[PDB]
């Protein structure tokens, strides 16, 4: 639990860059403007995998986290 | 000339004060006028033990080197400085080294103290009880730090062997006291 | 040209690039150069600065007075009567004084010319080679423009001695040294002189195959015919190749 | 690939790709239920029309023989249409708008690359759009739009409201109402400024004397920009308050409103003043570049005296009547004397020309408005071109002491070496046209050189920091996964979310600190007027309340002292993240606070509010004793400022905030500090290589030949130096320091030799000189060491008068050092300076015959003596310092800073250890600039700290600025491995199936 409680701007490029990709490929909706609404209403089925430089990791979900 | 025995002695005693060894207050603060009594010069104290030389030869030969090892091993002293006044014979200081360590200083390299200079932040040698936390909170390793080299004149100042870690508290101009940890090689 | 150099093993070097009439023998960039005073030991430092002469086709620095004694001179008034003009000024006479001391043991022109020829292209073994070799060095490939005949020994003795007089005039600070940029030192060339440089290197090749075609016909001795022997396409290609592309020369050595 | 052409009618992140180019590129679209009813038209048309498609990846080449059996389209397929609007292309990331010709229009050649996926499109969108990373025509005309003079009648408002974008449909109410209701241009320019924004700047004409008692906030030139509450109250704008500088109104509107609110603040001003100017025009006639005859005749009355006072110094120095200033000869001090009298007349004809230009003059509208700088380049139009130079010197003699064939020899005059009386309006003399052809050739080449210099540092220094990043520890780690820095930039804070602020406990004095911050709770009429009636007993009664407020002030005295350790210079400008005087100036506007009434805030709520805040700002996590000291050092400098400008007295007296104010204020700092913590994932290497090569484009060598030299750390500096300070009472006298001065120069005996000769006088009683026979007998009346046989030669060296008392040299210490240098077998005889001829007689006591060997003795003493001083140490200068940076900074007994002058020494040649060791050379402040020589003495921590002192010095010499975080990464990638060297997505994602079960 030593990672930052916000979302860095590089996660948000890779969350919304891929969540809009699957919604383009016939997924259940919960393309680019679709996923912007879902994050800003906090409905996304993605768990962020943040490593650490030792080799470990920490698995965070979006509703555990403060979005920009 | 008496600068080159007063300022030198005022460097050694501030040296072994901050190497950890027991050093009293007033004998650090001897003026040159109060020094107007005095080789005849040898500092000999222990830790909170250490010997200090001034060979009368300006150039130390190996014939000088085997003399005091009779009084090294008998008087049970281990760490000792040799203020070699001019400068092969260093291989003799490798021979006796794994038992008792000794090292060599030039005379005029020591006339002024480099720890007092303003572009040198105050290093602190860390202990193995303190290293074993810093390797664990940051989850660092034995390497993987900013390294410092062996023949560094502050590594030579504190008498740091290969493998220790010093901390550096530098007064910086965005936070005030950024703290950095130099591995020694 | 009395230039100056920055780092090298000299102080106030001279230079000349003699040639006559834009004939053959393109250049012979003979230097005359004064050594520094940063010498070690009593080789130079205890006597002072010396003068040398980087002659062409000699991979050494043959000193001055040796060259004049290869010109048929003996005595050290008749070597300084070609270098310094007034013998009544001590400020110049000091300067040449430590260069007589190094060229001192050689007197006869059979010896200095042995000294000069012993450093050549391939060094000869007999003395009669080194009498022969440096005899044509110092009258065929050293200052051609002052004279190319076999009797210009008295002439060359001045204009070589003239350069040493302009070596001293800048070494003393008694004369400004030459700017390298200045366009009084610059000759331009136009389509005339450039094709003359390209026609000499191709009129010899016309002769070269006539040397080849005839000597392959001495065995017969039947006749000889030139109108089949002049290869006309030597001239009408190299003057058309090297004037098309721009690589100004022959097409066999392009870099 | 084609031209770019300017076009101010595109919102900045747009490009105009013409239809002959967008009809070749493709964006491969994958079919959704959205576009499956849209793309079938674009399949139907084909490649004939423009909105069509090339391929159908079902791979059918739909451009010829369409085959309508294979016009199927179900979801999952990939269609490759040509282009549309709205799509994103790469340089930054533009956005295609279609404007039909043959040029790429973009609102200020290039290729065009187009990404091919909906993932790497949105990487460009949320990282690298054109706003996410101001022309002359706009930035000048903002001055003319925003004076007091400009009034817009009624119809022109209806146009300059039509060309906004953010406008809410409602027309403002004008100022004047006796005629037609005229609108001032500052009212409409208040409508662009986006929401509540606060700023105060000073226009570039504002005299400093205008800040007296009267006319402070009025400022009758209508300078002094005051933007309160997003509505422009007063002041003209310029470049200084609309560029991107410190405290700028465009800078402030990036630290409050985001970036997409500021991109609208550009594309409003890029229209409504760009399209108001069709009513003003802004031409430049040649009437705008002519001096009136009041000054044009006086501008020659300077230059007719300039060429007089160059004749005055030539004929003074051609009579041996000019004393050479020490440091240089009579030659170099002649040139410095005359280049003094050609840069004052170049500037006395430069300030009287700018002031004489009229208020309508159209050059003054492009200089006062500051949009086009270089106000020296229109002082050559009007008055005087000035001096020419090559190699930094006025024109050298080319031919033979004659710079052109029109002159005489010995022409050092004020026109035969380059200076130009005429200006470009009056035309140039046919000589001076050649000389300006030479000054324009030396600067025309350096441009062709400084593209192969700084086009090479920046593409090399990137490969240094190619992958140095910020990992999730917020340490600084790189490819070879080693720790560079433990916290990023020494406090973890990020680069582009900090400002300049001041401390106000460091700078003031000791009495003022106990007057400004003390809060005397006892006088009872302050807190009557500065605080409410409900609390006027509450402060006075409880001693527990009164004993906390000392413990606020107890820390502030111990906060004062640490600032006087970190900042010994007395320089209080500090870089710190959230501006604690805008955000207090804001909170006096949102909450509508009257500061002329007694406040209503409790003073313990001030103290408790700060202390509970300062725990909530976490840079270093953890409850360890390691991380506890490792936190409060990363926030020491900011937590001292955080009590100085939120004190219990400063809230209630200078700021007058309310109880509902301070609740909003402290909680907003925490929400604004928590953004300036750096986002781990930053490619910091590109951010800090492109902030050192950009001021690379803009006699110690400074600039590119120094900056090139620290990138490879050359062992042999082309100009090394060693600046040397002093210790005692010698520091305040030039006569005491002359002893210090002479102990550094390598003084051989060539410098003091008059002349040298060799005689042969074997009998001293019958020497060739009869004058020395007095004192030669004196050493031989009672002779010493003539024991067996003196060699019969005599080396006679004469000495000097100037160079022998310039250094206070003794005939003994010359003779003693030769006797100690070569033994007693060189019979050296000193003599007296009391007579007017100083003689040193050197005989020899008994291969290499003695005439030669006496020369070799003499040829060693010309070259290698070292009479005094240290070898390889050239001319050793001396001056009292002029600039307020290298002076001595002594704190008085009232705590005030004070600069005190002392004699410093700037040498040439570096030998650090013997220099430091000698008498009254400062152990502390002595420093050299030779990194290599400073690394072999003081360690590695005087390289990491003092490679900073050089890279800051090759940048701040230009006046430019680099954020310090880009210097603590160049200093910390060279010195990582203990010794200096030259140069030459961490995370992942997982699919959450438990959320994925529900959701249609």
mmCIF file of N, CA, C and O in Angstrom, chain D residues 368-394:
data_model
loop_
_atom_site.group_PDB
_atom_site.id
_atom_site.type_symbol
_atom_site.label_atom_id
_atom_site.label_comp_id
_atom_site.label_asym_id
_atom_site.label_seq_id
_atom_site.Cartn_x
_atom_site.Cartn_y
_atom_site.Cartn_z
ATOM 1 N N UNK D 368 7.317 49.522 -26.984
ATOM 2 C CA UNK D 368 6.574 49.695 -25.737
ATOM 3 C C UNK D 368 5.653 48.513 -25.494
ATOM 4 O O UNK D 368 5.581 47.983 -24.380
ATOM 5 N N UNK D 369 4.992 48.032 -26.543
ATOM 6 C CA UNK D 369 4.148 46.862 -26.377
ATOM 7 C C UNK D 369 4.950 45.596 -26.179
ATOM 8 O O UNK D 369 4.368 44.570 -25.826
ATOM 9 N N UNK D 370 6.259 45.633 -26.418
ATOM 10 C CA UNK D 370 7.136 44.557 -26.041
ATOM 11 C C UNK D 370 6.997 43.296 -26.848
ATOM 12 O O UNK D 370 7.733 42.341 -26.584
ATOM 13 N N UNK D 371 6.071 43.255 -27.811
ATOM 14 C CA UNK D 371 5.870 42.093 -28.658
ATOM 15 C C UNK D 371 7.094 41.780 -29.483
ATOM 16 O O UNK D 371 7.444 40.607 -29.622
ATOM 17 N N UNK D 372 7.776 42.798 -29.983
ATOM 18 C CA UNK D 372 9.048 42.615 -30.663
ATOM 19 C C UNK D 372 10.092 43.325 -29.827
ATOM 20 O O UNK D 372 10.089 44.553 -29.739
ATOM 21 N N UNK D 373 10.981 42.556 -29.209
ATOM 22 C CA UNK D 373 12.034 43.129 -28.400
ATOM 23 C C UNK D 373 13.142 43.721 -29.243
ATOM 24 O O UNK D 373 12.904 44.143 -30.383
ATOM 25 N N UNK D 374 14.356 43.748 -28.685
ATOM 26 C CA UNK D 374 15.547 44.298 -29.332
ATOM 27 C C UNK D 374 15.325 45.766 -29.713
ATOM 28 O O UNK D 374 15.218 46.137 -30.882
ATOM 29 N N UNK D 375 15.206 46.595 -28.673
ATOM 30 C CA UNK D 375 15.099 48.033 -28.887
ATOM 31 C C UNK D 375 16.423 48.688 -29.261
ATOM 32 O O UNK D 375 16.473 49.918 -29.348
ATOM 33 N N UNK D 376 17.492 47.918 -29.463
ATOM 34 C CA UNK D 376 18.712 48.460 -30.040
ATOM 35 C C UNK D 376 18.672 48.386 -31.561
ATOM 36 O O UNK D 376 19.445 49.077 -32.231
ATOM 37 N N UNK D 377 17.764 47.598 -32.132
ATOM 38 C CA UNK D 377 17.783 47.386 -33.569
ATOM 39 C C UNK D 377 16.905 48.386 -34.308
ATOM 40 O O UNK D 377 16.811 48.331 -35.536
ATOM 41 N N UNK D 378 16.249 49.294 -33.595
ATOM 42 C CA UNK D 378 15.631 50.452 -34.221
ATOM 43 C C UNK D 378 16.267 51.741 -33.741
ATOM 44 O O UNK D 378 15.824 52.825 -34.126
ATOM 45 N N UNK D 379 17.283 51.654 -32.891
ATOM 46 C CA UNK D 379 18.128 52.801 -32.608
ATOM 47 C C UNK D 379 19.226 52.957 -33.636
ATOM 48 O O UNK D 379 19.943 53.959 -33.609
ATOM 49 N N UNK D 380 19.370 51.986 -34.527
ATOM 50 C CA UNK D 380 20.252 52.096 -35.668
ATOM 51 C C UNK D 380 19.552 52.628 -36.904
ATOM 52 O O UNK D 380 20.232 53.124 -37.804
ATOM 53 N N UNK D 381 18.224 52.490 -36.986
ATOM 54 C CA UNK D 381 17.445 53.177 -38.018
ATOM 55 C C UNK D 381 17.684 54.665 -37.937
ATOM 56 O O UNK D 381 18.073 55.314 -38.910
ATOM 57 N N UNK D 382 17.488 55.213 -36.754
ATOM 58 C CA UNK D 382 17.302 56.635 -36.585
ATOM 59 C C UNK D 382 18.635 57.333 -36.385
ATOM 60 O O UNK D 382 18.952 58.296 -37.091
ATOM 61 N N UNK D 383 19.421 56.868 -35.419
ATOM 62 C CA UNK D 383 20.540 57.690 -34.997
ATOM 63 C C UNK D 383 21.907 57.260 -35.496
ATOM 64 O O UNK D 383 22.504 57.961 -36.312
ATOM 65 N N UNK D 384 22.413 56.121 -35.036
ATOM 66 C CA UNK D 384 23.817 55.760 -35.233
ATOM 67 C C UNK D 384 23.917 54.251 -35.262
ATOM 68 O O UNK D 384 23.461 53.590 -34.329
ATOM 69 N N UNK D 385 24.523 53.703 -36.317
ATOM 70 C CA UNK D 385 24.746 52.261 -36.383
ATOM 71 C C UNK D 385 25.726 51.817 -35.305
ATOM 72 O O UNK D 385 25.497 50.827 -34.604
ATOM 73 N N UNK D 386 26.827 52.533 -35.159
ATOM 74 C CA UNK D 386 27.731 52.263 -34.063
ATOM 75 C C UNK D 386 29.060 51.691 -34.491
ATOM 76 O O UNK D 386 29.629 52.099 -35.503
ATOM 77 N N UNK D 387 29.563 50.744 -33.722
ATOM 78 C CA UNK D 387 30.869 50.156 -33.939
ATOM 79 C C UNK D 387 30.720 48.862 -34.719
ATOM 80 O O UNK D 387 29.703 48.179 -34.620
ATOM 81 N N UNK D 388 31.716 48.555 -35.536
ATOM 82 C CA UNK D 388 31.860 47.230 -36.110
ATOM 83 C C UNK D 388 32.944 46.495 -35.343
ATOM 84 O O UNK D 388 33.818 47.116 -34.739
ATOM 85 N N UNK D 389 32.886 45.170 -35.360
ATOM 86 C CA UNK D 389 33.957 44.386 -34.776
ATOM 87 C C UNK D 389 34.140 43.109 -35.568
ATOM 88 O O UNK D 389 33.184 42.558 -36.110
ATOM 89 N N UNK D 390 35.379 42.644 -35.620
ATOM 90 C CA UNK D 390 35.695 41.255 -35.910
ATOM 91 C C UNK D 390 36.612 40.742 -34.817
ATOM 92 O O UNK D 390 37.493 41.470 -34.351
ATOM 93 N N UNK D 391 36.357 39.506 -34.375
ATOM 94 C CA UNK D 391 37.068 38.843 -33.276
ATOM 95 C C UNK D 391 36.952 39.620 -31.965
ATOM 96 O O UNK D 391 37.801 39.490 -31.083
ATOM 97 N N UNK D 392 35.913 40.438 -31.819
ATOM 98 C CA UNK D 392 35.782 41.301 -30.666
ATOM 99 C C UNK D 392 36.607 42.564 -30.708
ATOM 100 O O UNK D 392 36.583 43.330 -29.741
ATOM 101 N N UNK D 393 37.327 42.816 -31.795
ATOM 102 C CA UNK D 393 38.155 44.000 -31.937
ATOM 103 C C UNK D 393 37.705 44.803 -33.145
ATOM 104 O O UNK D 393 37.238 44.249 -34.140
ATOM 105 N N UNK D 394 37.802 46.120 -33.031
ATOM 106 C CA UNK D 394 37.604 46.989 -34.176
ATOM 107 C C UNK D 394 38.683 46.728 -35.216
ATOM 108 O O UNK D 394 39.826 46.416 -34.878
#
